[PDB]
Write a structure and sequence with these properties.
Shape of chain H: globular
Number of strands of chain B: 11
CATH topology of chain H: Glutamine Phosphoribosylpyrophosphate, subunit 1, domain 1
CATH class of chain H: Alpha Beta
Oligomer: part of a larger assembly
CATH architecture of chain H: 4-Layer Sandwich
Number of helices of chain B: 6
CATH topology of chain B: Glutamine Phosphoribosylpyrophosphate, subunit 1, domain 1
Number of strands of chain H: 10
Number of domains of chain H: 1
Number of helices of chain H: 6
Number of domains of chain B: 1
CATH superfamily of chain H: Aminohydrolase, N-terminal nucleophile (Ntn) domain
Radius of gyration of chain B: 18 Å
Distance between the termini of chain H: 71 Å
Helix content of chain H: 25-40%
CATH class of chain B: Alpha Beta
Order of helices and strands of chain H: HEEEEHHEEEEHHEEH
Helix content of chain B: 25-40%
Radius of gyration of chain H: 19 Å
Structural class of chain H: alpha+beta
């Protein structure tokens, strides 16, 4: 009624429609490499009127937790605002644990106000989260109704199927260094229609040193020699 | 409409609120009114249909006093109109209690209009079935007159009319040359315009409720002395 | 017809339909008339009896020494309005020791009943009220309809077949200010008798009178108290 | 059903209520243009005044949200005023909570969040008014943003909203693709010629109301009749 | 409320044939300090009722605001009725009683004068909710000093004329100024009658100091 | 095209010949400027005949005072100010056509090309093209 | 500390000391006690510094919002009403003496006082603070009617100087603020510029 | 007219919404609990085994909910998460109140009471999740309980809750022997029934997750059998299968 609702006999029809909406069209690949995690996404603005340094698809929820998303950007904001408040509350209660990767699983779990309390209309965004404050990286996915999936590499876009196929075929693998971001950009290339450029593509990296949204300078540097 | 015109919270396929589009119809159906900003004040006027002679002297008057200097001439569903007038009185009293002095008419109209819009936004509550002019005068700000429709917003009016015959009234209002005519001749002319508008051609006899505000009344929005404005009604009759 | 289902919804043709149905609640009720005067207000109510064994029910409800009401319609949410009006009058008595003037009371009732006409899940108070009061400006008669739009009246009647009583009151209302108490009460009695079918006629058991005057506080006369008024009936059923 | 009646996800995987609400903005018959410049940010909307009994003094669609942020509304005027009031409340509350004035991007973000809450849930409905707010921000130059009934807040350099918004956006795209910065004259002339080409009436200097925020002169100058006339004379020269 | 800071000193008033006259000086005593010397402690409740107060002037201003607002609301309806001074006295009484019951008392002792229905009324209500009406009334040290003169005049003359009544009020004000520390030589005198409420203004009383030479 | 708001026929009748006398030889440009203000007033009042008469009087003054350059920039300003009234500008171009054909001179070629530039901004089939045709023939 | 306001033709002049005392130690010798509530409206604070700051900031909130929603500069009377309401509703908790002044086109230079308790009064001149109680006679005797801008400025500067030199809780520098239609001009008197009435008691 | 949920009866008198949810619990998920002396164990079927996961949560079906018990859901994960959180909260609240580990039956009764409330009053969906619990207490020793979304729990000793729960329970009934049952033979039975209910023979140790609760010296140890131990169990089962098949 005023929660995550509309579940018929052996189905969650409203949730299934929400996932149909989260099919979206922003590819937003994610790769969990040995050194860290890369969340890359496509910012294909309509016309040149819009700006790219104005709004962002990658959001640092805290010191080393970075977040990327899928369709329904208006819902994604609210979700990332809630996530920031949740990580901050956890850090305030358990004071000074520099909590990112021992907090990445926990924030993914506290992503239950995410959907288990939908809010009449469930959220329409599936989001990938990256963290590296455990000596090991973590890439999780939270979907408009499910929970932490703990991916190693995936995509959430209009062509997420062949994107994931590309990821496994190009062998997401386990020995890949931090610069699997090249492979991430390749995976985007597949689900991208245009000469992608620095403002066109937005990518964040979360390594053991912390999280950082790569500026257009580095994004263009990586896009060169592709 | 058919499917989409059931609750105001449901937008139309073209993007319209059919609940308000229908609430405007009640104002269009109810009896008319008029208000003219004279040179140094605002004069109201509204014909009231005496549906039965059983009623006493003019009661449930379409005019109301919302504050000391402010008056409200309303048309449409009269019960909700009165409740809205009470909302306006409460708003004026609250503003006087908080910020002192008297509530400026533009802000009063804006606040009551935002309140009305709150009642059309949601689903559980329904839009108000009334449209009303708020008229006021003061030495500092001259004379102001704002009309609020059942769902829209206040608009500054030199002269406005609402109700059964808006266009018929507005034609002769715009024919009249305001902004240099004193509130006396305006009080005559508003009665003239109301009587030009149909009163008994298809309906019963009508009562002429006329209201004043201006430096001739040093503010203090009050009903015009009906005994001495019966001659103004006579001049309208001629 | 879809648009007639709920009070909140608004008909495309204009006014809503649930409110218009609410007035039929007062239409479907026993008749009552109420008339002013120069100095008195009188209510005559046809106490509708269920069966000869049962009593003729209660109408013309009591509110205060100077105000008395007559209901016509849904009795359920009518004792509620009576409680509200009694409470407000007692509140006025408590705060500034003066009888609450009727007009202020009627405006309060109108505002109170207006809200259910706009709040979802709340039915309008489908009760016709004939308030008779004596404030400082002589006797007053007010009619309150479920559409929350009250009216002031020189003489008004509500109930089943009340149109005939309305017509009689209109035709004789010129000679209402200058009438003795008994003359006015007999005017009202004739008006009410003209309502019910020719087979029915006024009895001491099926009529109630509410009288409020300058020196006479509101009083509910009946059978015994009524016979002196019922005399000189001039019966033309 | 009710997929297209309430704010719920469509089986096809869309949200039809907000899709409708966007067309409400086109409804109402108005257009508005905003051009960011080298140093200033100028916006302009037509002032459709039917009959002169209205007060052209108060028919405007642009407002000061704070001392440096100016907004233009597009769509239903009641919702437009409600959102303007909300934005002013947010600006004042921000100035109270944090010492420095609210950045325009942050204000647009808060308004967008309010609208996103509205498109969430089912009791309320989205407000059919798209707001273009502009302001000078230090270390940022002029800044223009657009909040929409959905909650997507963005929009820059050249952005338009209203009935004929697409044609205006196309022309402004041509102009911005023409690589030359607009000074505090070319920006205004560009906005004026854009809106004029959209609605060719040659724009008598009384039917548009332009707001200007320069860097050396902050504040939301609602340019007067004389200023807009001077700009029109200079442009048509 | 709990501890007044700026207090207004005494106010008095007597009713006569066809009208009432009250008087209050224009000093706001910040304890022993004559901080405010040009303040009015007399309010026009309506066209036919006046009110004065002694005590916390902030509380007096709040009551003035609330009562003026309720009078404005009453007159907005245009029902022809009004708040008779008896009803006003009752309303103030209850307000004060409600405040004491809530244990947030209003530090004001109030005198309400009025002339309605051709009969003068002169009410009295204090902080503790005690209220009554008497032909002569005074507050604070006024009830100790000026009141006895009013009582001894009224015992022999149950009814009074306006001119001698206001002369008596002026003499009582002179006595209060002579023998009250908080008093001041600037008082307003307000007269309610059938014609309405008329306030004279910053009246002053002449001081006599011949007895100053009786020191030696 | 657009409904007339405020006529100034009395004003132009009472003032224009007096202005012509005051600037019989055209040494004063304040007269030209004040008639420009008057015709701007009548244009904002959406009057066509008064504006056309003002433009005809201006070009007639330029004819009689034979200031060829000031004529060129004056007619440029008149045709380019806001476009004014199409009827009025078509008129003014017509009397300019009637005038340029009577004085041989050397820079009447410049006058012809100036009017050609004023009329070639468009509005050819609408609002008089025979003038442009005759100007091209005159250039030939 | 001491705060004072004077109304002249076409504007007002405000003078405040820069000292805020805590017990017998000088917490802040350069306190800025002339808080601009709006562009042409200023506040002088006395008493509990925290409470004064909170009340002034809340009123600045409400007044700026109200001015923006009217598209008109607010009235000094409206500001004083906001202060009186804020002080009166919370007088039992908030103990602060406030002097409001400013200029608005509606009336011009206006000055109001809201001491502890929550009363509002309009005065030609206003005086408050701990050190105010020592210059009442001087301010009352040496105040004329129709004084011009410079006369009011010098007279207020002198009154503040004497209040500072006499009261132990007042000292430091003097802040003056001249408010008029042209705008507000704020100046500071320090050290030698302080108008001094030396008391050279004979041996 | 406004939408109203269905928490009502049938013309016959059935709660068909609850029945549909309970049947849907059979769809998706597969868990089974077998009780034995000195050790009671749970086996779970790893539904999605895509190679792009990392298995860092260490447990998906089996959840440790208390020192002396562990549960396993078979429903919608959204409800499963909140139900496990509420279950742990209930157990720990009991521990706070009585300074003693909560008996398994009391814990299960609390959980089924919350589910009964969810299906009883208000316009709230029933919790579409059915879960097993294995635990040890002082009063009854090793206990196994199965709770359905209907809130009607049952004290079992060999049961399954997954898709082919009918086949699994038939296999358990055929090859279950009480008393003689011990931990190791219980493990053999569990892997055998899992191999039966999972069509692909030679089940990989990754597709099966099993956890055993055992009673050490005055202390309950809940060990989730890791990959090597699981596949060694698989190898022993394979040896038994080959021997039995060839000896005919």
């Amino acid at each position: 009624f005023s929660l995550t609702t509309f579940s018929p006999s052996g189905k969650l029809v409203q949730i299934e429609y929400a996932l149909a909406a989260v099919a979206g069209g922003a590819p937003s690949v994610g790769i969990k490499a040995a050194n860290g995690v890369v969340l890359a996404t496509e910012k294909k603005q309509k016309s040149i009127l819009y700006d790219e340094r104005s709004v962002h698809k990658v959001e640092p929820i805290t010191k080393h937790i970075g977040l990327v998303y899928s369709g329904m950007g208006p819902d994604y904001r609210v979700l990332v605002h809630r996530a920031r408040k949740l990580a901050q509350q956890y850090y305030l209660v358990y004071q000074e644990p520099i909590p990112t990767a021992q907090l990445v699983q926990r924030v993914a779990s506290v992503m239950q106000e995410y959907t288990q309390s939908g809010g009449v209309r469930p959220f329409g965004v599936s989001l990938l989260i990256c963290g590296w404050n455990e000596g090991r990286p973590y890439l999780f996915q939270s979907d408009p109704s499910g929970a932490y999936f703990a991916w190693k590499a995936t995509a959430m876009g209009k062509n997420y199927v062949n994107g994931k196929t590309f990821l496994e075929k190009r062998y997401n693998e386990d020995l890949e260094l931090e610069d699997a971001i090249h492979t991430a950009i390749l995976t985007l290339k597949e689900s991208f229609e245009g000469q992608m450029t620095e403002d066109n593509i937005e990518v964040g990296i979360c390594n053991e040193a912390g999280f950082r949204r790569l500026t257009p300078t580095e994004v263009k540097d990586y896009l060169a020699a592709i | 409409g058919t499917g989409y015109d059931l609750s105001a919270s449901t937008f139309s396929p073209d993007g319209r609120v059919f609940q308000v589009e229908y609430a405007m119809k009640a104002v269009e159906n109810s009896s008319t009114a008029i208000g003219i900003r004279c040179k140094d004040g605002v004069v109201f006027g509204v014909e009231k249909l005496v549906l039965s002679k059983l009623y006493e002297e003019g009661s449930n008057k379409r005019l109301f006093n919302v504050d000391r200097h402010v008056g409200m001439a309303v048309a449409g569903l009269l019960a909700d109109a009165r409740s809205l007038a009470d909302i306006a009185r409460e708003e004026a009293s609250n503003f006087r209690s908080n910020f002192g002095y008297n509530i400026p008419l533009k802000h009063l109209a804006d606040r009551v209009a935002m309140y009305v819009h709150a009642y059309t936004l949601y689903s559980a509550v329904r839009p108000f079935g009334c449209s009303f002019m708020l008229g006021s005068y003061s030495v500092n700000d001259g004379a102001q007159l704002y009309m609020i429709d059942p769902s829209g917003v206040s608009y500054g009016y030199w002269g406005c009319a609402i109700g059964k015959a808006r266009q018929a009234a507005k034609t002769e209002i715009e024919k009249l040359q305001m902004k240099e005519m004193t509130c006396r001749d305006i009080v005559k002319e508003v009665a003239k315009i109301i009587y030009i508008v149909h009163d008994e051609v298809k309906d019963k006899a009508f009562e002429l409720e006329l209201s004043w505000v201006g430096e001739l009344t040093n503010g203090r929005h009050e009903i015009v002395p009906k005994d001495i404005r019966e001659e103004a009604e006579k001049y309208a009759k001629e | 017809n879809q648009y007639d289902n709920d009070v909140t919804v608004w008909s495309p043709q204009g006014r809503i339909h649930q409110i218009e149905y609410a007035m039929e609640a007062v239409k479907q009720g026993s008749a009552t008339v109420g008339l002013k005067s120069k100095t008195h207000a009188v209510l005559v109510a046809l106490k509708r009896a269920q069966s000869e064994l049962a009593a003729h029910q209660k109408k013309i409800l009591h509110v205060d020494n100077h105000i008395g009401i007559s209901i016509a319609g849904l009795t359920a949410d009518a004792r509620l309005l009576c409680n509200f009006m009694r409470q407000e009058c007692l509140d006025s008595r408590f705060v500034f020791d003066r009888p609450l003037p009727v007009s202020r009371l009627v405006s309060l009732i109108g505002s109170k009943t207006q809200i259910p006409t706009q709040r979802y899940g709340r039915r309008p108070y489908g009760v016709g009220l004939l308030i008779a009061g004596y404030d400082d400006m002589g006797p007053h008669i007010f009619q309150t309809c479920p559409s929350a739009n009250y009216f002031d009246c020189r003489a008004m009647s509500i109930g089943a077949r009340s149109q005939s009583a309305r017509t009689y009151l209109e035709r004789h209302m010129s000679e209402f200010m200058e009438c003795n108490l008994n003359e006015l009460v007999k005017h009202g009695l004739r008006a009410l008798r003209e309502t019910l079918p020719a087979e029915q006629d006024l009895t001491t058991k099926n009529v109630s009178i509410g009288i409020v005057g300058k020196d006479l506080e509101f009083t509910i006369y009946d059978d015994d108290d009524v016979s002196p008024f019922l005399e000189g009936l001039e019966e033309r059923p | 059903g009710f997929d297209r009646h309430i704010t719920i996800f469509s089986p096809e995987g869309r949200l039809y209520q907000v899709e409708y609400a966007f067309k409400a903005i086109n409804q109402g018959g108005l257009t508005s243009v905003a051009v960011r410049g080298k140093d200033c940010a100028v916006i302009v909307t037509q002032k459709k005044v039917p009959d002169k009994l209205l007060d052209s003094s108060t028919v405007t669609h642009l407002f000061k949200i704070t001392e440096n942020i100016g907004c233009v509304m597009t769509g239903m005027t009641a919702d437009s005023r409600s959102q303007v009031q909300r934005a002013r409340y947010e600006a004042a509350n921000w100035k109270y909570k944090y010492g420095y004035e609210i950045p325009v991007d942050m204000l647009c973000k808060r308004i967008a969040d309010i609208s996103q809450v509205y498109t969430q849930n089912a009791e309320m409905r989205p407000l059919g008014c798209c707001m273009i707010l502009i302001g000078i921000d230090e270390e940022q130059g002029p800044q223009v943003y657009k909040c929409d009934p959905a909650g997507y807040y963005c929009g820059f350099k050249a952005t338009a909203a209203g009935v004929k918004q697409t044609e205006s956006t196309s022309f402004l795209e041509k102009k911005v693709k023409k690589k030359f910065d607009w000074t505090f004259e070319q920006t205004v002339e560009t906005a004026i010629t854009c809106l004029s080409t959209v609605l060719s009436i040659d724009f008598k200097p009384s039917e548009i109301e332009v707001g200007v925020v320069t860097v050396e002169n902050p504040k939301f100058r609602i340019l007067t009749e004389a200023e807009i006339d001077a700009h029109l004379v200079a442009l048509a020269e | 409320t709990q501890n007044p800071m700026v207090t207004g000193t005494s106010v008095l008033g007597v009713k006569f044939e066809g009208g009432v006259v009250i008087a209050a000086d224009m000093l706001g005593s910040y304890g022993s300090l004559a901080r405010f010397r040009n303040i009015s402690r007399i309010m026009r409740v309506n066209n036919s009722t006046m009110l004065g107060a002694s005590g916390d002037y902030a509380d007096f201003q709040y009551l003035k605001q609330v009562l003026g607002q309720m009078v404005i609301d009453e007159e907005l309806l245009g029902d022809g009725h009004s708040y008779s001074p008896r009803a006003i006295h009752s309303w103030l009484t209850r307000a004060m009683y409600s405040r004491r019951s809530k244990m947030n008392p209003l530090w004001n002792t109030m005198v309400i004068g009025g002339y309605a229905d051709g009969e003068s009324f002169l009410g009295y209500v204090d902080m503790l909710g005690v209220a009554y009406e008497a032909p002569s009334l005074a507050t604070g040290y006024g009830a100790y000093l000026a009141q006895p003169l009013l009582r001894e005049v009224l015992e022999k003359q149950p009814v009074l004329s306006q001119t001698e009544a206001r002369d008596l009020v002026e003499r009582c004000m002179r006595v209060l100024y002579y023998r009250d520390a908080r008093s001041y030589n600037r008082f307003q005198i307000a007269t309610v009658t059938e014609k309405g409420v008329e306030i004279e203004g910053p009246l002053s009383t002449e001081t006599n100091w011949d007895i100053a030479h009786m020191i030696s | 095209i657009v409904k007339m708001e405020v006529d100034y026929s009395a004003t132009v009748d009472q003032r224009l010949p007096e202005c012509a006398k005051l600037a019989k030889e055209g040494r004063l440009q304040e007269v030209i400027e004040t008639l420009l203000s008057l015709e701007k007033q009548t244009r904002t009042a959406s009057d066509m005949v008064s504006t056309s008469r003002i433009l005809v009087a201006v070009v007639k003054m330029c004819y009689e005072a034979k200031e060829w350059d000031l004529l060129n920039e004056n007619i440029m300003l008149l045709s380019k100010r806001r476009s004014q009234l199409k009827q009025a500008v078509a008129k003014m171009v017509q009397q300019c056509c009637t005038y340029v054909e009577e004085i041989t001179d050397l820079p009447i070629k410049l006058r012809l090309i100036d009017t050609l530039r004023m009329v070639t901004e468009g509005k050819i089939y609408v609002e008089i093209e025979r003038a442009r045709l005759t100007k091209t023939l005159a250039t030939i | 500390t001491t705060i004072m306001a004077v109304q002249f033709d076409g504007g007002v002049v405000l003078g405040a000391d820069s000292r805020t005392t805590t017990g017998s130690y000088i917490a802040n010798r350069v306190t800025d006690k002339l808080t601009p509530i709006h562009d042409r409206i200023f506040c002088c604070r006395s008493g509990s510094a925290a409470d004064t700051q909170a009340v002034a900031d809340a009123v600045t909130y409400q007044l700026g919002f109200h001015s923006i929603e009217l598209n008109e500069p607010p009235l000094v009377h409206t500001a004083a009403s906001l202060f009186k309401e804020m002080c009166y509703r919370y007088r039992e908790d908030l103990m602060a003496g406030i002097i409001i002044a400013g200029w608005d086109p509606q009336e011009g230079g206006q000055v109001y006082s809201v001491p502890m308790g929550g009363m509002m009064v309009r005065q030609s001149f206003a005086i408050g603070g701990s050190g105010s109680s020592y210059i009442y006679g001087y301010v009352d005797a040496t105040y004329r009617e129709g004084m011009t801008k410079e006369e009011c400025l010098q007279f207020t500067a002198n009154a503040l100087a004497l209040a500072m030199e006499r009261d132990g809780s007042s000292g430091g520098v003097i802040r003056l603020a001249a408010i008029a239609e042209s705008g507000v001009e704020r100046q500071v008197l320090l050290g030698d510029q302080i108008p001094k009435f030396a008391v050279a008691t004979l041996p | 007219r406004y939408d109203s949920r269905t928490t009502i009866f049938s013309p016959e008198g059935r709660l068909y919404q609850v029945e549909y949810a309970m049947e849907a619990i059979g769809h998706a998920g597969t868990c089974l609990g077998i009780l034995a002396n000195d050790g009671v164990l749970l086996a779970a079927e790893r539904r999605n085994i895509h190679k792009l996961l990392d298995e860092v949560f260490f447990s998906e079906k089996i959840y440790k909910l208390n020192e002396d018990m562990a549960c396993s859901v078979a429903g919608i994960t959204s409800d499963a998460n909140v139900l496990t959180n509420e279950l742990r909260l209930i157990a720990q609240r009991y521990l706070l109140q009585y300074q003693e580990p909560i008996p398994c039956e009391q814990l299960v009764t609390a959980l089924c009471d919350i589910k009964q409330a969810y299906t009883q009053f208000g316009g709230k969906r029933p919790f579409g999740v059915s879960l097993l619990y294995i635990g040890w207490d002082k009063h009854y020793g090793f206990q196994l309980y199965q709770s359905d979304p209907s809130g009607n729990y049952g004290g079992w000793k060999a049961t399954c809750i997954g898709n082919n729960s009918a086949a699994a329970v038939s296999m358990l009934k055929q090859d279950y022997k009480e008393g003689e049952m011990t931990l190791k033979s219980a493990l053999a039975l569990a892997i055998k029934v899992l191999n039966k209910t999972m069509d692909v023979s030679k089940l990989s140790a990754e597709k099966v997750e099993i956890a055993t609760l055992t009673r050490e010296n005055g202390k309950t140890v809940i060990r989730v059998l890791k990959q090597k131990e699981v596949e060694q169990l698989i190898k022993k089962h394979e040896e038994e299968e080959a021997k039995a098949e060839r000896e005919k």
